[PDB]
Write a protein that binds this ligand. Structure first.
Ligand SMILES: C=C1CC[C@H]2C(C)(C)CCC[C@]2(C)[C@H]1CCN(C)CCOP(=O)(O)OP(=O)(O)O
Length: 685
């Protein structure tokens, strides 16, 4: 590992250590609504917001996202800023440059498609127009395209459930700037614990203008401080940020470098977890299935005890929804629900239904090319989801998922759509992409070495004459490396790849008759005690030779002597195999891997939990109706494997790793040449 790299890791660590209320971009629109606020004496309550606007104008006269031009974005941002500037009679030059932009550009809005269109635009846009008309700003109010949105507003305003909106919490509280006669009597009772209206600085700034409420003021005051002048279009965004950074780091395959920092993150998220789920911000009376599903999964997969009853709230009539009691469905929310529902323990019927539903939703959405999210612009959503649709979590191996995700991750070019456009530099980062591209290529270089060495070994012991095909050789190595890929873990990887090749040699050479097995087992135990049968003795020598090479290699590195335990474990497999066909092959791979771990864990081979696990892994692994029986079994394994105190964890996971490898092979074994190719033989980039 070079120094540029070592430094990149430090930086990412200083980010994770310093996560706060969210690293989000300023929203010219939202900071213009904050800047419209009267202290009480006809002066801006928030000077710094007025100042931000005067100093962050793009050179073509507009405000908004500088690297992605959207007529919807730039028009609503500039209008708001010009209004803010003009009603304090401040900064004439920039204000004028701003109106010129708006005039020359309002005509183009009529032709951009409403496919990527901001939240509450048809309502919030005419509202500014009015404010502007009533301060004598010279803009085309008649404009063929304008009298058109004035209309869409009034018609959008009649779909609104005014009754409900005032009685119970809904997402509408986020977009109040556009609405008319509101009962602030009833609305203030729907305020959030931080004094905002659904964590929106513009909506809250509006409410304060109308109520002079002291809590809305406190919230706006913290926002203005946090971002040194400007404000985002959502705040806080802390839960969302924690959960998304973790998810990206794990998918990009570089999660292990930051194991400790990631634990602080999930710790923070568990702190503000609730029985109703969560939303993007801590302490909310509103929750969404997207944030909740991402948290549920990341938590359960890391041994936090969370409950699936959390999903009861988003379901009606066997369907699931983004927000409680709203009819909103989004592609990315269902996607994250589908990923979460696969971590279902055998008792959770709510998650069986969640899986079945989110599967079809995404399935149909695919067969209509409608796999795009209106709310977010990503490099490759259809790709991410295609992978999840064909490679179930039970069959997803670290290196395979990661290999595909590094090509899909958009880095800094991903753009989120709220009321304006905004970016999340700590979730969508080019730095993470380069780090991941460099790390992935290094481990792959290392696997290419081990694979040449591994071929030589296969030739030198003439394993081809023992019934092991070159196809099996590569498949045995690929599964080992696609699962345990870290360069610092060659021992566990190699022992796995070799042990599997050898169980294949022994099984195809001596597994036919009910005593030819005995013959080999006897030969093995004779070969042991020196501290037809001719043939058996030669194979046994290959096994023993390989066993000795590895336990000594280990002892060379760590000073552990595991030789006897290696033999014992292979003898146990035979006692079992001797009676029937190829039986407990699964349990044996787990023991090998464990025995080659840099630290000692043999203590646990005795524990009931290890025994119970071993009992299941062996019912998964055996020489369409069976694929089903596999999920059944694996279901029993997932509960047991994850719900573990963190001493035993490294054992339980290892069980999962092996089981996944088998399932994956049962599901894809027939055509693996594409995966193998991309994973082992094609550098990223
Ligand atoms: C040489 C290969 C043939 C057989 C194949 C399987 C045995 C089916 C397993 C997947 C990879 C691979 C090894 C495969 C990959 C070779 N890899 C370097 C990828 C192909 O490389 P190339 O021949 O130089 O052409 P290029 O893509 O334009 O650069």
């Amino acid at each position: 590992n070079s120094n540029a790299f070592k430094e990149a890791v430090k930086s990412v660590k200083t980010i994770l250590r310093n996560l706060t209320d969210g690293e989000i971009t300023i929203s010219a629109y939202d900071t213009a609504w904050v800047a419209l606020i009267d202290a009480g004496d006809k002066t801006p309550a928030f000077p710094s917001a007025v100042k931000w606007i005067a100093e962050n104008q793009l050179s073509d006269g507009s405000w908004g996202d500088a690297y992605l031009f959207s007529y919807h974005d730039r028009l609503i941002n500039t209008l708001a800023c010009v209004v803010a500037l003009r009603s304090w009679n401040l900064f004439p030059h920039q204000c004028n440059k701003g109106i010129t932009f708006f005039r020359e550009n309002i005509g183009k809005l009529e032709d951009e498609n409403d496919e990527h269109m901001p939240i509450g635009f048809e309502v919030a846009f005419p509202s500014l127009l009015e404010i502007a008309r009533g301060i004598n700003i010279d803009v085309p109010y008649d404009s063929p395209v304008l009298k058109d949105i004035y209309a869409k507003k009034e018609l959008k305003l009649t779909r609104i459930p005014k009754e409900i909106m005032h009685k119970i919490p809904t997402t509408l509280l986020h977009s109040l700037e556009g609405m008319r006669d509101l009962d602030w009597e009833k609305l203030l009772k729907l305020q959030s614990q931080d004094g905002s209206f659904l964590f929106s600085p513009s909506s809250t700034a509006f409410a304060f203008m109308q109520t002079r409420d002291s809590n809305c003021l406190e919230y706006l005051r913290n926002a203005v401080k946090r971002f040194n002048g400007g404000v985002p279009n959502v705040f806080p965004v802390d839960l969302f940020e924690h959960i998304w950074i973790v998810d990206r780091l794990q998918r990009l395959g570089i999660s292990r470098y930051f194991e400790e920092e990631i634990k602080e993150c999930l710790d923070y998220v568990h702190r503000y977890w609730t029985d109703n789920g969560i939303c993007w911000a801590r302490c909310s009376h509103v929750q969404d299935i997207d944030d909740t599903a991402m948290a549920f999964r990341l938590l359960r997969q890391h041994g936090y005890q969370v409950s699936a009853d959390v999903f009861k709230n988003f379901e009606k009539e066997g369907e699931f929804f983004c927000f409680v009691g709203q009819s909103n469905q989004a592609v990315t929310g269902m996607f994250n629900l589908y990923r979460a529902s696969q971590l279902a323990f055998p008792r959770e019927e709510i998650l069986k239904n969640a899986k079945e539903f989110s599967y079809n939703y995404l399935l149909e959405k695919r067969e209509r090319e409608e796999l795009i999210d209106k709310w977010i612009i990503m490099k490759d959503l259809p790709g991410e989801i295609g992978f999840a649709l064909e490679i179930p979590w039970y069959a997803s191996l670290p290196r395979v998922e990661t290999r595909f995700y590094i090509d899909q991750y958009g880095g800094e070019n991903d753009v989120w759509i709220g009321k304006t456009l905004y970016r999340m530099p700590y979730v969508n980062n080019n730095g993470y992409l380069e780090l991941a591209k460099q790390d992935y290529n290094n481990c792959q270089a290392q696997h290419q070495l081990e694979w040449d060495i591994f071929q030589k070994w296969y030739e030198e012991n003439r394993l081809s004459e023992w019934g092991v095909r070159r196809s099996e050789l590569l498949e045995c190595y690929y599964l080992a490396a696609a699962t345990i890929f870290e360069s610092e873990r060659s021992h566990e990887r190699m022992v796995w790849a070799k042990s599997s090749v050898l169980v294949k040699a022994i099984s195809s050479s001596f597994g036919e008759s009910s005593d030819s097995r005995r013959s080999f087992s006897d030969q093995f135990h004779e070969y042991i005690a020196n501290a037809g049968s001719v043939q058996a003795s030669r194979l046994a020598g290959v096994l023993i030779g390989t066993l000795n090479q590895m336990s000594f290699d280990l002892f060379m590195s760590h000073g552990r002597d595991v030789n006897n335990l290696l033999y014992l474990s292979w003898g146990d497999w035979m006692e079992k195999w001797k009676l029937y066909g190829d039986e407990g092959e699964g349990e044996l791979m787990v023991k090998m891997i464990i025995l080659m771990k840099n630290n000692d864990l043999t203590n646990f081979f005795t524990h009931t939990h290890f025994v119970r696990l071993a009992e299941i892994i062996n019912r998964i692994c055996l020489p369409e109706k069976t694929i089903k029986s596999m999920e059944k079994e694996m279901g029993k394994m997932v509960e047991l494997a994850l719900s573990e105190s963190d001493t035993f964890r490294d054992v339980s996971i290892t069980f999962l790793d092996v089981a996944k490898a088998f399932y994956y092979f049962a599901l894809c074994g027939d055509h693996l040449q594409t995966h193998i190719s991309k994973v082992l033989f094609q550098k990223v980039g």
